[PDB]
Amino acid sequence: MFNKKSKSRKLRGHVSHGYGRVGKHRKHPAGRGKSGGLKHLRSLFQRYHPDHFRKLGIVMFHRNKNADFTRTVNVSNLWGLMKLEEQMKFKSSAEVPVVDCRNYGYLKVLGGGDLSVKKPIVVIARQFTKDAEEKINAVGGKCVVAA
C-alpha cells in the first residue's frame, strides 16, 4: 500500500515501548559501530562475514577506469541489436548485414547460444572467443578485428 500508520502510535499507554522490563533500552549495550569483531562479536563474523580479517592481492597505486572499461555480448544476441523492422528485412533479403558492435558500446564477443538466423553475417569487434569465431565461420560469416 502507498500509506500505512506506524507502530509507535499503537504503543501509547504500554510501559516499556516494546523493549522489555528486565532488559530495558539502554544507550549502547554492545559497543559502537562494527567493533568487537575478533572478541565478543566473533560469532557474527564467522557466520556471515568469514573473509573480513585478511590482506590479499596485487597492488597498483593508481588505476584508470576509462582504460579498462568493457562490455560483452553473446553470439545469440547479435541479431537483436538491430531494430525489429530491420531484422524482418534482412531475414528474407538477398543481402548480408554488416554489424559493428562498437556502435552500441560493445567491445568483446562471447560464444553463448546459437545464431538467430542461419545466413551469413559480418561482425566487427575488438576481440572474439575461440567458440565465437567457429560459430560465425560455420554459417559462412566473417569476423573482423578493429580498434
Binding site: 579498462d68 572499461f69 568493457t70 562490455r71 568483446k108 575488438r126 576481440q127 578485428v145 578493429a146 580498434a147
Partner: protein, 97 residues
Amino acid sequence: MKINKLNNASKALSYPVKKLAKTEKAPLTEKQQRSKELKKFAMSIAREVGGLAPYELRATELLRRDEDKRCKKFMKKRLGSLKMAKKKIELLAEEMR
C-alpha cells in the same frame, strides 16, 4: 563488474591515421647569434675576476693524481645529482687542459 575483460594484446591496437610532419625550427637569425655570444663572453670575465671555489680546487687536484673514482664520489656528495657531477667533472677537465 564491467572491468578487466580484454587481454593486453588487444588493448594495444590503434586506428590508422594520416600524420603531419613537425615543422623544424633550426634557422637561427643574426641577432640571436650575437645575443648568445655576449652571454658566453660575460661568463668568461667572471671566472677571470674571481677564480675557482674551494671544492673545485680539491676536485682538480684529484684529477692530476688520476684519482678518477675518488673524484666521482666526492662530487656526487657535494652536488647531490650524479648527472650534475658528471657534467661538472667534464667542465673542470677541459679547464685544466
